[PDB]
Design a binder for this molecule. Structure first.
Ligand SMILES: OCC1=C[C@H](N[C@H]2C[C@H](CO)[C@@H](O)[C@H](O)[C@H]2O)[C@H](O)[C@@H](O)[C@@H]1O
Ligand SMILES: OCC1=C[C@H](N[C@H]2C[C@H](CO)[C@@H](O)[C@H](O)[C@H]2O)[C@H](O)[C@@H](O)[C@@H]1O
Ligand SMILES: OCC1=C[C@H](N[C@H]2C[C@H](CO)[C@@H](O)[C@H](O)[C@H]2O)[C@H](O)[C@@H](O)[C@@H]1O
Ligand SMILES: [Ca+2]
Ligand SMILES: [Ca+2]
Ligand SMILES: [Ca+2]
Ligand SMILES: [Mg+2]
Ligand SMILES: [Mg+2]
Ligand SMILES: [Mg+2]
Lengths: 548, 548, 548
């Protein structure tokens, strides 16, 4: 199969990973010096947060120049060396393609805001790069994403004397995909990096490209059409590259972003629908929603692969759960108002689970066992915390924690001069949570992650198999099979914090012996009616094979 | 009107309030020395927990003798002084009538377990006192109440070689109320205490008296009949005395336990329907469930009053809430499995609200301003915590905390020798939480409670007026009026942790000023459409009078 | 800008914070061991009370060696370790420079008092260090500061047979700043500590340096000139250090102590004029004094920052308020004779506000929201009380209360062996009020204070913004805006104990939507003419931003 189908992805932010020169900002040289770490961990493809020139009002997702390297990060030369050394070690690298909008500081908007027509009466060709309105009445009753900050998706520009559209911050005016010069402007952005050897893109905020009156301005067919065309371009000019979609929508609409066999869109999309149901189930001690929401995902094209994930650099999003499910999530996972933002909970994986390794390991094993390619968020493999004193979603973007030295090993700059402060609290600060500690610790979470990815490489059914759920007679116990190329894996997992009993419907497997993938230790042979009694300890995960 | 309509109740346990003599067990001489404190708090009626002789397998709710005083608590003489001194201070006292069942140790059951006929052939009249079955397949698919202890509501008696019935523990066999001799053993048990001057009874577990095949064995019309004859008795032989029912059922089944004007039952029932919705609304910042369960309550007889309460000696009960309501409450209010028992949450009021006085005060103001008569659980007026290392529901029955001396002022005996250990943790311990502390502190929870009761007493609409909810334009803001004898109170309460805006429908009251009950500070008069704009700070409660 | 404009200051006393060796006295080893506490609280600069050798007749403000460490506190090595550990955590430190006077035990004064001419007939260079009069009739009609102790500002030295000047205790003779050798001795004291890395100085009693006949001997131009020279010396030889002035004068004279842009003096002064008016307004429930006094303060130099404080190690000074205001304050806050001392009230914050956390929280938020940098008095963040059985102002200097073990955690010596006895009363004693308790209490005053500072960090308009008072129609409601960097904060505060309504004049902000800084909950958009109705609870603080 395709290479993204067997990849382990790792999300990181250059500005925040490793500082080479002491100025308190992460840079490409520093990242380059930590590629062995990543490769040794089991990671195949790096996804880098936006690295472009930017005023950084949205941490670099407000892009001022698509064909360069933000000075904080080094030079285009440093980037090219980084990418040569990543491929040297057999890693792929994808970047973040911000397509729905640019920074207000981008030259195109600096131009667009001079008005429709130029001092000499000739049309301003850049005015139609963005979306203007005289009074801002259009696209009413359209959802506001950054609700804690924006009262409107229209904002009046003082120089233009008109309103411009923005699905995100006001300093992030939306591009106009009804204008064909904009479609080409970002094909050209794509070519610039694909040409240098980048292996693909995470494509950002794709559901919000085209706005149409009388609709939600999400998932519009006019939007999908642009993505089909973006895929046809890459498919022709750069075979083998990866287009990955950030499309947090409900199951029926998400699968649309893969396109069809006849008309392909994305190769992979994040599985936003299952993510919140993992957390809900852990609290409810009941994995129904996991099974229900996955069952609502229609089959995807041949070339398609899901990207599975526990957390990332944004909040834990509650946009696409029901109202009762959202209320449950704030109650169970955000007991401080400060942990809420913009319809989601802005916390890291370990804090979200009360720093309980049994529960952390549990969800990571579901992450590695569900059908897709997993993506780890940087620092989650050592158990990093968060700093909710930082604004917006930056509390989960604090410096990587490398050792107990100055600034957690992130920089020789003082923690007060680092672009964000390395966490220093008594539970998750870098005197306790760092890579150097966990490399010497024989039983560290980091060592555990490495070992678990290793276990998964051994069994291609994780990467490529189907998924069939198994009845257990106990909602605390989720059980399913993964079949691929002759091998059958049984995954049994307890989402309860005490011992749980189950009776597994192993009818199709009578006469087979389940045996542990780790240590090749066999269980009683399935007999009789195949209803198989099991007991599990708290947050237990059973990775088993069903014999030939 | 009736005295229980204007009364403030207060629930305590003699074994646990005050130890007079130094042996570690609270007693009636000790309780007697604290009547002045209770008088000064603003309390009118003491409800005592079961004081009868007993092996204490359900803390005295397993009664071995309905006509005595448990030796722990002193003697029947000590009882008589206590009731003289309480009455001398204008206090009413009601006992706990454990009707549905007795202790296995009661001399009734020791006789009934010797078989249907005696060793000399004659028939054993005590056998039909309890409910029996040879195989114990009757009344199946009936709910277990103590789901964490009892596997079945039938248990084999080894000597009588049959099964007996028990809705509660196996040492608490149900009484057979088909047998009219049992109805008369409890009438005469009631008569014993009423003859001594006791002002009433709280009656225990009244839904579960009669059991019949093909029914749930709850609120059976037969059970109600027995209650009707109990009130008919008391109305005749002891006018003015009080019958109060513990009936945890859904709004439509609970009002039945009042009877009708023509056929009366209880004077008072505990308003269980609203109790869990108070907590949900605080966590959801959504006061909707309060208005809906209050709305499902049908009007009650003329003589009837609700008994409003936040907590008691039992768990917070999750039996009469939906499955999603129950699952939400576990998430929001029971982070540990230890905190759970028997479809409920075994935690004191202050721990339930994270010791946030602003929240504690809010639920109290709602407790004091809903229609009915409030009952305070002992020690919640100084903010006692709990001890969840103690079995069953004992963790909310730890000794009262009077001062910072030996065992919190409860006993001269060591904490290890007290019947329950006085709490000594750094947050709720008697070094931090005690009555001497809060009589000196000008602003303690204790003095706040005494003053809020003082303020309530000044406005009889609180105890007898009607309830009209009011539209606020914000699920977080609960607003209602109370109307009685020409007074109109307006009770606005924020259930959200941040500031909240609201538009109150004061259309009926255009032209009238609202003014504070405390301080006589008037707000702007209501005008025009009477949509009254209001802002509220976190957890704010506005007690206001609408001028005339 | 400069670091002290963003700093949160914290005032502590080494002898009283933490004893690191069991001898009952705080020391620098002990204070070093508590630095993570201050860091995690959100403190940036530690103002340490006088740490010099001294007989402690005024608790170390009678200095006897400006270049050493009082043996109670440890050695100069201990001081160096403390400064290294403070800076290693991003904490600045400043000392208390006692410029106006030395101890009578100071070597200089033991020398000066020998007479103008030594036994060998040669002159005594140290006689002219202090201020001498032959009959003590100069500067008559000049205020006595320590009115409860000192009957005159001239006292007869037994040995010199002349009169020496002292604005303070007779054991604190005033230094004579007309002698330029004196001026050099305190530039030299400054240099010593400024050379070890200390970040600056709180400068004690700076109005009273120079005395002149026919004046008040306050705020004289000759005193300001010496202070300009002190600023010049630091500006040149130690750039970036902080000079903070203690000048309790009337609003006009206070501002002089900043100097001018051309001839600079102090970087910061305490905002003494506003401090009493905060208390006046809380008792009157009328905030006009807060506005009248704030508005008599002229604009300050570019480098100027105000230091805001509620209480400190002194008495609550009533020196700079009218006779009627002072009589009110005595009536409202000094019921017992014992509570007055020298034109002022000697009580801690929490006793002053009757331990009402609502009122403690209100004034703390005004402290954090007025223009300036805030300074917290140690132990006030946990609600410490006072011991008015101690003499002078020591009642507010009792040891920090850390846990509920021996002496409250301050020392392993018994309370009766501690320099001052740690409080043990039922309301404020370390058994009820201590750090460890309040770290476990999910709702403690300590956590509140930490979180409120974090709220403040997030909005630079608090440190840096301007201030426009806003009409409300209700004197009980104090409303103002803070504008900086185009972020606009609206801060509304109720100073009364019941609900209050008002009409905010928000005309400059029509079309803006106010949202809570905590939670982002929106109030209605300002419409119409910006007359915005609000209702507030008792002692409510609305902390709002005006979303643009
Ligand atoms: O709807 C799902 C999401 C999409 C959005 N995430 C992406 C789009 C935004 C584009 O500027 C950006 O802030 C964010 O980091 C990106 O990863 C949003 O900001 C998230 O908070 C949210 O969970
Ligand atoms: O359904 C309401 C309830 C009734 C039951 N409460 C009473 C019945 C039990 C009788 O022995 C007794 O333990 C309990 O204290 C009484 O107040 C039960 O134990 C509670 O858990 C529960 O909230
Ligand atoms: O007028 C303001 C004040 C200054 C003075 N405070 C300082 C000067 C004194 C110098 O010896 C000292 O006692 C006090 O602690 C210092 O902080 C005075 O003692 C206070 O009572 C008073 O509030
Ligand atoms: Ca768009
Ligand atoms: Ca029964
Ligand atoms: Ca002087
Ligand atoms: Mg760098
Ligand atoms: Mg006793
Ligand atoms: Mg010491």
């Amino acid at each position: 199969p395709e290479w993204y189908k067997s990849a382990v992805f790792y999300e990181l932010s250059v500005r925040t990973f490793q500082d080479g020169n002491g100025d308190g900002k992460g840079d490409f040289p520093g990242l380059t010096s930590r590629l062995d770490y990543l490769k040794n961990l089991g990671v195949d493809c790096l996804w880098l947060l936006p690295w472009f020139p930017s005023p950084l009002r949205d941490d670099g997702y407000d892009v001022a120049d698509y064909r360069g390297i933000h000075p904080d990060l080094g030079t285009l030369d440093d980037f090219k060396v980084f990418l040569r050394e990543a491929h040297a070690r057999g890693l792929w690298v994808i970047g973040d393609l911000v397509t729905n909008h640019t920074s207000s500081d981008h030259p195109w908007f600096q131009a667009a805001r001079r008005g429709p027509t130029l001092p000499d009466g000739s049309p301003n060709e850049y005015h139609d790069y963005y979306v203007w309105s005289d009074e801002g009445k259009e696209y009413a009753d359209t959802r506001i994403i950054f609700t804690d900050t924006e009262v409107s998706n229209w904002t009046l520009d003082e120089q233009a004397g008109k309103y411009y559209w923005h699905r995100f911050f006001a300093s992030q005016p939306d591009l106009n995909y009804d204008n064909p010069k904009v479609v080409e402007e970002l094909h050209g952005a794509a070519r610039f990096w694909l040409d240098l050897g980048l292996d693909g893109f995470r494509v950002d905020a794709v559901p919000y490209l085209i706005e149409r009156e009388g609709t939600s301005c999400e998932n519009l067919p006019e939007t999908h059409e642009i993505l089909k065309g973006f895929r046809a371009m890459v498919d022709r000019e750069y075979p083998g590259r990866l287009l990955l979609a950030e499309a947090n929508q409900w199951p029926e609409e998400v699968v649309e972003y893969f396109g069809t066999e006849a008309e392909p869109e994305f190769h992979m999309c994040f599985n936003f629908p299952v993510m919140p149901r993992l957390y809900m189930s852990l609290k409810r001690e009941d994995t129904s929603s996991i099974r229900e929401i996955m069952g609502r995902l229609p089959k995807i094209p041949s070339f398609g692969q899901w990207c599975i994930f526990l957390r990332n650099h944004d909040e834990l999003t509650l946009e696409m759960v029901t109202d009762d499910e959202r209320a449950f999530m704030y109650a169970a996972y955000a007991p401080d108002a400060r942990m809420k933002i913009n319809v989601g909970i802005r916390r890291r994986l370990a804090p979200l689970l009360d720093n309980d390794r049994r529960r952390i390991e549990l969800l990571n094993t579901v992450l590695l066992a569900l059908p897709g390619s997993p993506v780890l968020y940087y620092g989650d493999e050592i158990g990093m915390g968060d700093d909710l004193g930082l604004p917006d979603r930056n509390g989960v973007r604090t410096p990587m924690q490398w050792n107990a030295g100055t600034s957690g090993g992130f920089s020789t700059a003082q923690p007060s001069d680092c672009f964000f402060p390395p966490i220093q609290d008594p539970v998750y600060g870098f005197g306790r949570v760092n890579v150097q500690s966990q490399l010497q610790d024989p039983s560290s979470l980091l060592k555990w992650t490495a070992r678990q990815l290793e276990l998964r490489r051994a069994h291609p059914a994780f990467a490529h198999g189907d998924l069939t759920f198994i009845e257990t007679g106990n909602p605390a116990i989720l059980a399913f099979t993964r079949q691929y190329d002759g091998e059958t894996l049984l995954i049994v997992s307890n989402f309860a914090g005490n011992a749980q009993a189950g009776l597994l419907d192993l009818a199709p497997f009578v006469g087979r012996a389940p045996v542990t993938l780790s240590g090749a230790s066999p269980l009683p042979v399935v007999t009789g009616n195949g209803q198989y009694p099991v007991v599990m300890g708290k947050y237990d995960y059973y990775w088993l094979r069903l014999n030939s």
